[PDB]
């Protein structure tokens, strides 16, 4: 209430405004990290593939699960049948190895757009994953195999479970992400826990906060897989995994 | 009083002059670190924006709070709606990503020019901040959410509170600045506490010493938020935060 | 079961499909790491060499066992007789020093294509190996000399033995691979156990999972060499080696 | 006294000469490190400035005390009034940022040429110094504020005090120099105590050994400031500071 | 005995062949590391030098023993007489500083081609060696001076002594090689024991395995020097040296 | 005595020759490290300088003692009188900053050519030396000031004293050389004791082994300075210094 300049007064009165929380949360969601647009990816696949899109997509996802995004490098070190088919799919769908643009269709983006399929496939193919049971068995007992892939973050619910459940599932999953990031990213070779976490913090939060894949389907699927119990809280293995990550 | 040359005598007599403290403090304030001119920023926004400037500014501040200054990089990884609006605002206001000049309007400069609004918005949007409750909860209990942003330094008062209060508030805030600097600045990756502090010492002191945002408004606002008690000393959470930083 | 968009519904229904495990394992095998095609190598050798191919191949394998892949560098530091013959063989078979392509015939690829011969030859020539009994005797007692070469991975069976046996043999062999990788690869100079393992994980798993060299021949050969006992479990030396690697 | 060659004999007889100590000390003083010529600096200032030189010089010194030598960089981050005046002074006096030549007028050289004024001004402006009471209060209690600047070395006497007093004052001052060197010089980031000392050893000894600023004026000034007691030995704070540096 | 493809069968039958050990050891010797051809060196020296070759060779060997291979660099820092003669010898014999080719005559190659002379000369000139008694006296007592040079490896016998004796002599010698490698090779500056050993493993084994210098002459010479006792086992000093290397 | 080839026999018989020790020591001295030719330096100085050469040389030596070899860099930071005279001397004698050639006259080479004068001058000017009593007083008590310079090595005798005395004097001197090397050579910044020793081992041994400056003059001078006692063994201070270096 002391005398001030007209520019100071503007700053002061600006800050006396009430916050419009609905509007501020809209803005914050529009400006938040987004790693991919799953509806865009699926639309591109289906429109290009027609009646072959489902079978084609499954093959691309197995590649993403087991070899990642590096199409050319990987195709040089794989069976002839696998390489021929992967190269043909790349030409057919315009697959690329890096997400340069919203339009970029990478194998990992395809996997993340269909997360319930991808994570079931990961569990089924757990013996083929670069970071799978062998690695996780050294860290804890009974790491959920559905968590051993880049798509599991999209299946962690925010609605229909407690915030403690959400946090625990994120931590349990971080145990795999931490390991996968370190094995596959050479820039993380000497990084601290906090540094490797920050390399996947934004993509993980974006996957969890996404509205594309409905929370109720996530909860029901996690219950069916036993990752959540019938009461909607994490299984013992999930709690052990989460504890292991917090302790890391 | 021994014989000396005429040049030595000049140096000696120069040093026998009394100091004009009023004049010396004027000089020292004119020459001190200044990071931005808030009146200049607000004038530019209001003159360009007219009756849209307030709503536009709020959106720019949410961006600054949650994504920082990197307009192009961030716009590549966000919703279409957010990116379209941010790009349009950049063209409209001439927003830039680095403070090259007094005239450079960066998103962070906009936030710092309206600090009471920005810090209230930060608390409201604390779950969206890159360095927010999750990080600070690992360090101490109940870190004030209003301190979780680049603008809080401007709200630390020098008049109307004790110097011990000023120092405590600076230390409590440094706990967040230290963390934020380390997460966002890769050059600080292996830096000591003292090195990361020195990266923000001058901007912080300049914010605290600024005459643009009146001290009495700062005190009243900190009391309203509970960061200061009714007696004008820091809350327990502020003291705990400050202790944690001194101990770091 | 809540209302959702048509793109969300597609993702949801995609994930409600049953997995075709036979088809998914086919895909995963086609896309898995493959380091070489042994039938291709042998066909090239035999078609080029005719009735000289066997004797020629044995000489190339001794080179691979004792000097590795670096044809030019090694030929500069060896007897005249050895160098002359190696250079002539290189011209004759189109030998190269790096596996650039499926077609690239490297000395190590030749050795790996004939693994029972190569590993018997390694044991016979153990005093000539760069990483042989002297190195392994410092780590454990009685390291199997047949394991002291790049081809042993192809002789670890997956069928006809328990999975515990397979795992133990892989670990026992890793003790040599770990040492060999460190001595020969300068990029691994400061690498952790996990980092050097990951440098040979994919080639090792590919050798073990290969269908080219029949599992029943592997089991019978390991029994004949005493690496497996008559009951089909690993010898004591193999168990000690495996324990040493786990403990490393 | 054994037979030797005529060249050996010359070397031997050269070394049998008596030393002319007066002449040798003259040579050693002429060849010793010199960082600046204060009479030259003052002459340039006064001849250029005329009746404005005193007020102009005081402003340049406040800049040197608080911002150092980096005229352009600092002027980009300061008030408009400060920047305008500093730039005008640079043009007027030919100020430069690095001492390339005896003629180079840097802000720090100006401060060092008028050391009693500069150190009194430093104490008066101690709350504005980049390395001031906050930093020194963490190291010891009651660090003399007159020592918190680049000019204090010129005020350490060699005549009129004991050599133990001279040494103690140099050590007490080194405590600040050590800290200032580390904060401002990034090349010293990982340097040992001995390495950072050697970065200022020659300039410090040259300041102490300079004949420009008379020893008797130094002693009298240090007594007036309480840095020396009436008996001409260092105050308790000086002894504590010196002990802290020796212990560092 | 299960059905397999014709390419698999070829690999299987290839491995059922008996090994021809005589032939395999011939191949392994032809392909083994060879560092130099001593007969070639001696032939070149004698044919170029005629009746001056012996005296010339002795001078070249003293250079190799005391200064190594760096002819130009060393000649810049030595007496005029030494430099003039060394340069003339270089022109006369085509001496070079690096073994680029079988034909390259380096000073060290000359020394290694005449190893009994070289090692006797090393002992005689032990006070002139860069790595001599001063260095070795810090490691153990009574290090054999004949071992203090690059040629001693050629005098370690494989026939006429036990394999334990051969191994002990190699280890005793490695104590000097380890030290010499570290002092002269700057790339080994931070290398581990194993890394510096691997830098000389192949040259050392090649020297020991060479058939050029007869084993019976080696044994007799080592007995004459007391490095072997009359029973053909290593002296106490050799055992102490070997123990010191194993313990290093 | 077994049958061998004619080239082997030549190598064997070469090694059966008796050593001519007088001739071998001549060769080893001619080929040994030599850092400078003092007679050449003195001849150049005297022939150029005529009757001014003595006074000129003394000035150059004071420069070498206090500032080293860096003529241009040092002249930029010294009194006008000193710089003018040094530059004139450089032109007059063709002084250079690096010993590129036998002919190169560096200030340090001049000092080393007249070592008894230089070391007496060093003691006289000990308060002006970059590495003097202040540094050495931290290491031991009463370090001989005559040892605080680059020329002292030339005054360590090999004849007229015991070898234990020679060794002790070398070690005592190494304590200063070690310190001086570390302060002045930035490449030695993280070097081990052994690495910094090896940087001056050859120059030191060459100075001690030089025949230019007669041993009897050295002994007599060290006795006159008290570095040797009347019995020709090192003073207590020398023994303490030597012990300190061995312990370093």
Swiss-Prot record, chains A, B, C, D, E, F:
One GO term describing the cellular component: host cell nucleus
Site residues by UniProt (RNA-binding): 67, 70, 73, 98, 109, 187
Keyword Ribonucleoprotein among record annotations: yes
Keywords, sorted A to Z: Capsid protein, Host cytoplasm, Host Golgi apparatus, Host nucleus, Ribonucleoprotein, RNA-binding, Viral nucleoprotein, Virion
GO molecular function: RNA binding
Residues given in the record as RNA binding sites: 33, 70, 109, 189, 199
Family annotation (InterPro entries): Capsid_Phlebovir/Tenuivir, Nucleocapsid_Phlebovirus
Main subcellular location: virion
Residue stretches spanning the membrane: none
Protein location: Virion; Host cytoplasm; Host nucleus; Host endoplasmic reticulum-Golgi intermediate compartment
Signal peptide: none
Organism superkingdom: Viruses
Subunit: Homodimer. Homohexamer; ring-shaped, necessary to form the nucleocapsid. Homopentamers; opened pentamers in solution. Binds to viral genomic RNA. Interacts with glycoprotein Gn; this interaction allows packaging of nucleocapsids into virions.
Function: Encapsidates the genomic RNA, protecting it from nucleases. Displays high affinity for single-stranded nucleic acid. The encapsidated genomic RNA is termed the nucleocapsid (NC) or ribonucleoprotein. The ribonucleoprotein has a non-helical structure. Serves as template for viral transcription and replication. After replication, the nucleocapsid is recruited to the host Golgi apparatus by glycoprotein Gn for packaging into virus particles.
Family: Belongs to the phlebovirus nucleocapsid protein family.
Domain notes: The N-terminus is involved in homooligomerization.
Protein name, as recorded: Nucleoprotein
Gene this protein is translated from: NP
